[PDB]
Amino acid sequence: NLMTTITGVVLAGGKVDKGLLELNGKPLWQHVADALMTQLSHVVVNANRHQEIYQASGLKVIEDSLADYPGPLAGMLSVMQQEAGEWFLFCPCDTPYIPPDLAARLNHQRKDAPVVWVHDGERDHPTIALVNRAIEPLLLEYLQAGERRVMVFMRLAGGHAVDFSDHKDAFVNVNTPEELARWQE
Amino acid sequence: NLMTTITGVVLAGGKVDKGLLELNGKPLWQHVADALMTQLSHVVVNANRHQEIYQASGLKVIEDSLADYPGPLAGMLSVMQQEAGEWFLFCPCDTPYIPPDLAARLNHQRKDAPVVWVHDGERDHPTIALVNRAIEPLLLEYLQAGERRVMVFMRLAGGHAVDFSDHKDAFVNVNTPEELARWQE
Amino acid sequence: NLMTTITGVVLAGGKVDKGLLELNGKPLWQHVADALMTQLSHVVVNANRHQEIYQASGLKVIEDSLADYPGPLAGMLSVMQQEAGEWFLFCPCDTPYIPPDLAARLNHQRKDAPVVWVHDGERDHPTIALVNRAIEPLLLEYLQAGERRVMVFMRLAGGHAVDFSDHKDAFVNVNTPEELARWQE
Amino acid sequence: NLMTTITGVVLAGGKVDKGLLELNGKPLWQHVADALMTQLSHVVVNANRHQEIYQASGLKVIEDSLADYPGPLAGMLSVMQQEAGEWFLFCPCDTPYIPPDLAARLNHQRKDAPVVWVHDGERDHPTIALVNRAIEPLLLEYLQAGERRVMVFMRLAGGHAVDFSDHKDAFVNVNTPEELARWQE
Amino acid sequence: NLMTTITGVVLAGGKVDKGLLELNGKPLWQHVADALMTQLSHVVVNANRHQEIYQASGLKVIEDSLADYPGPLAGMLSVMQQEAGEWFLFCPCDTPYIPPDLAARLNHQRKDAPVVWVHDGERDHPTIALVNRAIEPLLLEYLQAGERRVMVFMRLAGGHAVDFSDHKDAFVNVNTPEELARWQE
Amino acid sequence: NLMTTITGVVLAGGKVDKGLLELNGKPLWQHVADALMTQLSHVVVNANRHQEIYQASGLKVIEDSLADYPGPLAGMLSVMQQEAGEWFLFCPCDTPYIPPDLAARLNHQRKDAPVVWVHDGERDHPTIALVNRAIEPLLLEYLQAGERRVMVFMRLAGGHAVDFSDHKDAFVNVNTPEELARWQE
Amino acid sequence: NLMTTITGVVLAGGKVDKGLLELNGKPLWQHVADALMTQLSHVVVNANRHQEIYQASGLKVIEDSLADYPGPLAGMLSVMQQEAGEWFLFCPCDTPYIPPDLAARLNHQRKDAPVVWVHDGERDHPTIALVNRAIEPLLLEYLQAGERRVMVFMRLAGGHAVDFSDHKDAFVNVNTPEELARWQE
Amino acid sequence: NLMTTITGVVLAGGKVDKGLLELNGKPLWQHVADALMTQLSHVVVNANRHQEIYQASGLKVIEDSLADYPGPLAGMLSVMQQEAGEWFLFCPCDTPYIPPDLAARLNHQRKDAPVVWVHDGERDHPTIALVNRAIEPLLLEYLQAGERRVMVFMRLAGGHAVDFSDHKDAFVNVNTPEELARWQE
Numbered sequence A, B, C, D, E, F, G, H: 001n002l003m004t005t006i007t008g009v010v011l012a013g014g015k016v017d018k019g020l021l022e023l024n025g026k027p028l029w030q031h032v033a034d035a036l037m038t039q040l041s042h043v044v045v046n047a048n049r050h051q052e053i054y055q056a057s058g059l060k061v062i063e064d065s066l067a068d069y070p071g072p073l074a075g076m077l078s079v080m081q082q083e084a085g086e087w088f089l090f091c092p093c094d095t096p097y098i099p100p101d102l103a104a105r106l107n108h109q110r111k112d113a114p115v116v117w118v119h120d121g122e123r124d125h126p127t128i129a130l131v132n133r134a135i136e137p138l139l140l141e142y143l144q145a146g147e148r149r150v151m152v153f154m155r156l157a158g159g160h161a162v163d164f165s166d167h168k169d170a171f172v173n174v175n176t177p178e179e180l181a182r183w184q185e
C-alpha cells in the first residue's frame, strides 16, 4: 500500500511559527501532520525552530542542511539527504484542510513523472508535492547554482501539476491570524 | 491474477438471517458466495449466527471480534484481524446479482486509494467494497471512538465510489420476502 | 508471506477413509488440515467420498478428474486443474504430526526446483510435497502415458527430497487402528 | 516485455483445414503464426489434424484433451492444461491480417480482467482473446457442464471486449476460397 | 533496503519503567530505540505508562489493546493491529547493546519462516524478534485462548531461533540497578 | 524511478557533424545530451566520427556495428547490441529543445507497446523514441532484409506515436546554420 | 517458475551432424532437446545445416550471425541477438543424459553471476551454461577482437563452474559412433 | 541483471594522482574503471583534480561536496548525493587487478546488510565496498560529527567483510612507483 511507501513531510520551516496557532483547538501544523498520518505510516517534520514542540507529538524532526540554502526547496533537499525513502509527500504547515486522498490522487496522476504538485483550480501549490528522491542530485545542483524558485525547479525535473479543483477549500492556506478567524469553527 | 490476491468476504452479519431465503432454489447468501468464488480463489463468510450452515458449504467462518463493535465495519475489522491477506472484497449477503467483473472493475478504478466501493448509478453500496488491510489501524481507532457510519469511514480513509451504472440491476438488494418475490424466476 | 502464496491440500483420497478415525478426539484428517491452516491461508481437501464431512469443516472439496487416473498423482493433478494458485503443499490425511514449519522449510530448500518432498531421515514421503503448477503439463503427460509412481515423477520433474530428520516423529503415518493406539494421548 | 510473458496460440482446430490455403503464397495459418511471432517469443499451435505440417514450421503442436470437449473453448483449455504460461493470446487460423499491436492493445485494455477479446467495430471475435490461466478451473467446469458458447463463457469469467474499430480490415476472416480471392494480392 | 521495509518496535511495556534508568547518560530504552533507528527508518514504542516521555523523543507510542491481554505478546499484537507494515522488529527496552546488524542477520536467517528470534549462544531472547504480520490472526487466537508463553507461540507459528553467539555481550539484559552498575562506563 | 531504468542515447550519427555547431554557446548535441541527463542517469552517444569530442564530455561512445547497416535504425541496433539495458530513449543530435518530461510522457503513453515515438502535432519524429530491447531481433531481421524506413519498422514492431502537441517548439530540428540563426538567443 | 523464464538452446552447431545419430532410437540432439523441454517452456536450436530436420520437431532454428564468428560462442551470441529472453540455458547436441534438474541447480548456484557452467567432477563443460543476456555486449567485443576460447570468456564475464559431481554419467559426451555403442541400450 | 542495477565508482580521490601512472601501458585508474565497466553498465569517477583526464575516457566525474569532508567516506557521500542509484560499488584507483566477479560475490554475500567490503585473506579493503544508498543519512551524520574512520562507519551501519582469500593477488594495491615496478609485465 501507498501508506507504507511514501514518507510524509510537514514543511514547518524557516531559518513564532504561525503554524503553532490553534485552529479549533489544534495547532495548524498538527492539522497537517494528522492528515498525513491518516494516509501514511511514517511522517516527519522539517523544522529549524521549536524543534522540541514538533518532536513532542511523536514526530522525528529533520533540520536543514548546514549548506544554509534558501526556502522550501532547502527543506525538501535536507529531508531527502536525511531520510532513506524513495518517495516523499511534502506539505506546508498552514494548509490544514488537506484531503484524505492527497497521496493517492497525486500518486495516481504522476504519469511516470518524478514530481507532481497540487493545482487547486485557481493556483498552484508547488510545496504540496509528491517527490521521488531521484531528483535529489538535480535539486542539489539547482540550489548550489543559487536558484530558489520552486515551480521552476519542479518543471525542470519533469514534473507537472495535478488537478484538485473538485476538493472544495481543501487547500486554503492560513496566512495570518485574521484569515484563521474566517475559518475558526 | 486478481483471483489469487484478493480475499472474498460475504458479510452475512448481525449480532433467521434473511440471507438464508432461497432465490431460484439457492439461498441469497450463496448467490453472493458463488459470484465471489467465480472471481476469487479464497472466499470466507463473516457470520455470528448459523455458523454451521455457512461452514457447511465449504467456507471458513469468521466471527466478530469480542470488542462487540457495531455494524458492517465491525465485520470488516474482524475479518482483517483474522485473515492474512492484503486485499478484501466485501459484499453483503443480499445482493445476489453482483457481476462477474466486480473485483476487476473495483481494482482497476482504485486510482491508488486503499478503499473503493460501488455506486450503482442511483446510490452508494459502501459495504460492497474493495479494501486494503492498511486501513485496519484507522478502522480500529474509528470504532474505538464509537463511530459507525460506513461511507464516512471510507472517505476518511481516502476512498471513493466506483461507477457501476452500466451493470443493469446487478446491485438489487433483496430487503424482504416481498422484494424477493419480484425477482423469483 | 508464504501464508498467502501457497495453497494447502489434504490428500484425503481414494476412488471408511481411515483418516476419519479420531486421534485425541480429532479426526486424523483434521489434524492435517489444522496444521496446514496454521501455516497457510487457503487450504482445500482432495476427496472422492464423504465429501460432505470434509466440506462441513469449512474446506472446499476438490474431486478427482473424470479421467480416472490412479493414485495420489491423480489428486495432485486434479487440484492443479481446479485451483488457480502457483504453489501447492500437499499432505496425506494420515500424518497428523506434521510440523509448524513444513511450508517454510520446504520452500527454503527448493533450490529453484519446481517440486520438493519430505525425507524424514529414514524414508521419503513423496506425497508431502511442495509443488509448482508449472509441472501440470508434465504430470498430465505422465498419467496419460499410464505411469503412476510418485517419486519417479517428482525426480523426472527436477525435484528433490528435503531433510526433516531433526523433526522428531513429525512424519509418523497412522496406517491402522492399531498404530493409532500407539499414539493416542 | 510482453513479448516474453504471453504465449501465442494459433487455434488451427477441429476434430483439409481451410487454414492451409495460401494467401499471397503463404498459408492462412502461417500468416497468423507469423504475426504472433513478431509480437511474442513463444508461440504454439492447437491442431488435431495435419500436426506434422504445423510442426514443420518450427512450432510446437498441442492436441486437444482426450475429454473430447467441443469447439474453440476445448482448444483453449487443452493449451492451458499443457503449457505453463500465465497468459495466452489465442487467434484462429483464418484472420491473416491481425495487427502488430494485438497483444499490447489487448493487454493495455485488460482493466484487470482475466480475459479480453477483440471487437472490430462491427462484431465480436471472442476467439481472438488474451486469457489468464486463472480461468482454467472455471473453463473446465463450464465444458464439463456441457456448455460451449465462447462469449458467454468469457463474460462469466469477468471478461470484456476491446475496441479495435480503428484497425482497418485487420480482422477480416477468410471463411472460404471465394472470400480468399477477394483478398489475394 | 531493509531499512525502509521493517518497522522497529521498542517493547517498553507493562500494565518507574527500569528502562528509564540512564546508562552512560542515556536512558536504557533510548539505547534500544537509537540502535533500531540506525538500522530502520520507522520505529515506534509500545508503552502503557510514561507515554509522554517516549513520545517526546520523536517516537510514536502505541498503547496496548483494550482486550487487556498479558505480557509481551500483547504488545506485539497491539502493534500489528495499529501499524500497517508487513514486518516488525521488536526489542525490549533493557537490552541496550543490540548490534548494528540485528535486522539484517535476523532477516537473512529467516529461511522463509514468518518469525525468528535471537539465541545469544546461552539463551533465547524470544522478544527480540522479527515478525511478519501474517501471524496476527494466530496470535489473536492464542491470546484469546488464554495462552501467554512467547517462545511456544513463536514455535507454533513456524518460527526458529537465530544464532548471535558471535556477538559478544550484545544481548546483555539490564535487569536491575545493580546489573546496570556492572555496565556503566 | 524511470531515471535509473532507461538508457538515454544521443544519435550523433552518420557514416563536420552539424550537431557540433553551437547554440547559445553550447554545441547542439550537448543540448540534447544535457536534457537527457537531467532525466536519466546513464546516457551514451552513438557516433561514428569525432568520437573523442563526444567522449570528452564524459559520455560513452558507441560505434555502429560492422554490419554497415544504413541510417538511424543502424545506430539503434548497434546500441542495443552493445548496451545491457531493457529500455532506450533515443534522440537525434539536432533537437536541442527536447522537454524535461520526454521520458515520462513517452513511458506513460506506451500502452504496453515495445516502442513509441514523438508526434509534435505537425509531424512524426520517429527517431525520438522509447524502445524496448525485445525488438532487437526484429530490427536485426529488418536491416538484414535490406529495409531502412524508421517509422515502418516501428509500426511493424507494434509501436505508436505519442502526442506532444502541447510542448511548444520543443521539437524544432536545427537542419542548417541558417535555421540555427532563427533560434540563437 | 524457472520453466517460463529461461530459454533452452540446443547448440547443434557448425559451419552429417553426429548429433543426428540415434541413441536408443532417438537422435542424440533430440535427447538434449527433450531434456530441456521437460524443464523449460520455450526451447530453440542453434543450427547452420539440416535446419529443416531440427525445425520439423517443432523447434525454432536460429542460424549464426553473418559476422561468421567461430565456435560455440558464436552460436551463443547469435541466439542472444535473435531471441528476446533474459536467460538462456545452452547445451551441446551430444550430451544426451543431461539431468532433469539442470536449470534449477545452475540457477540456484549462480551466486549472482551472469554466467555459470557445469563441472561434472572431472572436467568443465563450458558450453553447458546458464547465461544472462547482459553479457551480450562483452561477447560481441570478445569475438570482434578475434578471441574464441569459451571458458576464458565465461571467467572474464564473472562466471563460475557449478558442481554436478553427484550426477552420475549425466554429462557423458558422445564423441563418436564407437562411444555411442558403449551407451546403446 | 546486477550489471544494470549497481553503479560503479572509481575513488580517484583527494583534495599527480599516482593513479595516473601506467601499468602495462594503461593508467592504474583505468585498470579499475575497465574492470568495473566489464561488470557494470554505468560507472562514474569521484575526482577532485585532473577532472578533464578522467572525463575524457567517457566517464562522468563527480566532485566532492562543498562540505569539505575528509577522506574516502567524503567521496562515497558525494557520489550518493549526486547519483540516483540504489547501489554503488566503490573501488580505489590503485587496485588494478580487481576480479571479474567483484560485484557478484559482494552482492551474493550481502546477507541483507546495506554495506559489504572486501577482506583479501590478510586485510580489509573497506573502500572496495558495495553500498546501499540507505546509509546516506547515517554517513552524513557521521561526517558531520567529525568522524572519518571507514571501517568503523561501515560496521556501525551493519556491514561486514566478505572473503576474497581465494582471489590470488587481485587486491594488490599499488602504493608507489616502486611497487608498480614489481608488477609491470
Ligand SMILES: Nc1nc2c(ncn2[C@@H]2O[C@H](COP(=O)(O)OP(=O)(O)OP(=O)(O)O)[C@@H](O)[C@H]2O)c(=O)[nH]1
Pocket (backbone or CB within 6 Å): A011, A012, A013, A014, A015, A046, A064, A069, A070, A071, A072, A073, A074, A075, A076, A091, A092, A093, A094, A127, A173, A175
Ligand atoms: N526548510 C526550510 N523551509 C522553509 C524555509 N523558508 C520557508 N520554508 C518553508 O516553505 C513554506 C513557505 O514558507 P513561508 O514563505 O515562511 O510561509 P508562508 O507565509 O506559508 O508563505 P506563502 O503562504 O507561500 O506566502 C513553509 O512550509 C515554510 O515552512 C527555509 O529557509 N528552510
Ligand SMILES: Nc1nc2c(ncn2[C@@H]2O[C@H](COP(=O)(O)OP(=O)(O)OP(=O)(O)O)[C@@H](O)[C@H]2O)c(=O)[nH]1
Pocket (backbone or CB within 6 Å): B011, B012, B013, B014, B015, B046, B064, B069, B070, B071, B072, B073, B074, B075, B076, B091, B092, B093, B094, B127, B173, B175
Ligand atoms: N459483522 C457484523 N455485520 C453486521 C452487523 N450488523 C450488520 N452487519 C452486516 O452489515 C450489512 C447490513 O446489515 P443489516 O442492516 O443487518 O441488513 P440489511 O437489511 O441488508 O441492511 P440495508 O439493506 O443496508 O437496509 C449486512 O451484510 C449484514 O450482514 C454486525 O453487528 N456485525
Ligand SMILES: Nc1nc2c(ncn2[C@@H]2O[C@H](COP(=O)(O)OP(=O)(O)OP(=O)(O)O)[C@@H](O)[C@H]2O)c(=O)[nH]1
Pocket (backbone or CB within 6 Å): C011, C012, C013, C014, C015, C046, C064, C069, C070, C071, C072, C073, C074, C075, C076, C091, C092, C093, C094, C127, C173, C175
Ligand atoms: N485423488 C486420489 N488420491 C488417492 C488415490 N489413491 C490414493 N490416494 C491418496 O494417496 C495417499 C496414499 O493413499 P493410500 O495408499 O489410500 O493410503 P495409505 O494407507 O496412507 O498408503 P501408504 O501409507 O503410503 O501405504 C493418500 O493421501 C490417499 O488419500 C486416488 O485414486 N485418487
Ligand SMILES: Nc1nc2c(ncn2[C@@H]2O[C@H](COP(=O)(O)OP(=O)(O)OP(=O)(O)O)[C@@H](O)[C@H]2O)c(=O)[nH]1
Pocket (backbone or CB within 6 Å): D011, D012, D013, D014, D015, D046, D064, D069, D070, D071, D072, D073, D074, D075, D076, D091, D092, D093, D094, D127, D173, D175
Ligand atoms: N481445439 C479445437 N478447436 C476447434 C474445434 N472446433 C473449432 N475449433 C477452432 O475454433 C475456431 C472456429 O472453428 P471453425 O467453426 O472450425 O472455423 P470457422 O469457419 O473459422 O468458424 P467461423 O469463421 O467462426 O464461422 C477455429 O480456430 C478452429 O480451429 C475443436 O473441436 N477443437
Ligand SMILES: Nc1nc2c(ncn2[C@@H]2O[C@H](COP(=O)(O)OP(=O)(O)OP(=O)(O)O)[C@@H](O)[C@H]2O)c(=O)[nH]1
Pocket (backbone or CB within 6 Å): E011, E012, E013, E014, E015, E046, E064, E069, E070, E071, E072, E073, E074, E075, E076, E091, E092, E093, E094, E127, E173, E175
Ligand atoms: N505490551 C505489554 N508489554 C509487556 C507487558 N508485560 C511485559 N511486557 C514487555 O515484555 C518485556 C518483558 O517485560 P518484563 O517481564 O516487565 O520486564 P523484564 O524484567 O525485562 O523481564 P525479564 O528480563 O524477561 O525477566 C518487556 O519489553 C516489557 O516491556 C504487558 O502487559 N504488555
Ligand SMILES: Nc1nc2c(ncn2[C@@H]2O[C@H](COP(=O)(O)OP(=O)(O)OP(=O)(O)O)[C@@H](O)[C@H]2O)c(=O)[nH]1
Pocket (backbone or CB within 6 Å): F011, F012, F013, F014, F015, F046, F064, F069, F070, F071, F072, F073, F074, F075, F076, F091, F092, F093, F094, F127, F173, F175
Ligand atoms: N548510427 C547511424 N546513425 C545515422 C546514420 N545516418 C543517419 N544517422 C542518424 O539518424 C539521424 C538522422 O540523420 P541525418 O539524416 O544525417 O541528419 P538530419 O539532417 O538530422 O536528417 P533530417 O533532419 O531527418 O532531414 C541523426 O540522429 C543522425 O545522427 C548512420 O548511417 N548510422
Ligand SMILES: Nc1nc2c(ncn2[C@@H]2O[C@H](COP(=O)(O)OP(=O)(O)OP(=O)(O)O)[C@@H](O)[C@H]2O)c(=O)[nH]1
Pocket (backbone or CB within 6 Å): G011, G012, G013, G014, G015, G046, G064, G069, G070, G071, G072, G073, G074, G075, G076, G091, G092, G093, G094, G127, G173, G175
Ligand atoms: N553456432 C556455432 N556452433 C558451433 C560452431 N562450431 C562448433 N559449434 C558448437 O559447439 C559445440 C562443440 O562443437 P564441435 O567441436 O563441432 O563438436 P564436439 O565433437 O561436440 O566438440 P568436443 O566434444 O567439445 O571435442 C557443439 O554444440 C557444436 O554444435 C560454430 O562455428 N558455430
Ligand SMILES: Nc1nc2c(ncn2[C@@H]2O[C@H](COP(=O)(O)OP(=O)(O)OP(=O)(O)O)[C@@H](O)[C@H]2O)c(=O)[nH]1
Pocket (backbone or CB within 6 Å): H011, H012, H013, H014, H015, H046, H064, H069, H070, H071, H072, H073, H074, H075, H076, H091, H092, H093, H094, H127, H173, H175
Ligand atoms: N573524495 C575523496 N576521496 C579521498 C579523499 N582522500 C582520499 N580519498 C580516496 O580514498 C582512497 C584512499 O586515498 P589515499 O589515502 O589518497 O591513497 P592511498 O595511498 O591509496 O591510501 P592507502 O593505499 O589506503 O595507504 C583513494 O581512493 C583516494 O582516491 C578525499 O579527501 N576525498
Ligand SMILES: [Mn+2]
Pocket (backbone or CB within 6 Å): A092, A094, A173, A174, A175
Ligand atoms: Mn503559507
Ligand SMILES: [Mn+2]
Pocket (backbone or CB within 6 Å): B092, B094, B173, B174, B175
Ligand atoms: Mn440489505
Ligand SMILES: [Mn+2]
Pocket (backbone or CB within 6 Å): C092, C094, C173, C174, C175
Ligand atoms: Mn498412509
Ligand SMILES: [Mn+2]
Pocket (backbone or CB within 6 Å): D092, D094, D173, D174, D175
Ligand atoms: Mn472463421
Ligand SMILES: [Mn+2]
Pocket (backbone or CB within 6 Å): E092, E094, E173, E174, E175
Ligand atoms: Mn528484562
Ligand SMILES: [Mn+2]
Pocket (backbone or CB within 6 Å): F092, F094, F173, F174, F175
Ligand atoms: Mn535533422
Ligand SMILES: [Mn+2]
Pocket (backbone or CB within 6 Å): G092, G094, G173, G174, G175
Ligand atoms: Mn562433443
Ligand SMILES: [Mn+2]
Pocket (backbone or CB within 6 Å): H092, H094, H173, H174, H175
Ligand atoms: Mn592505496
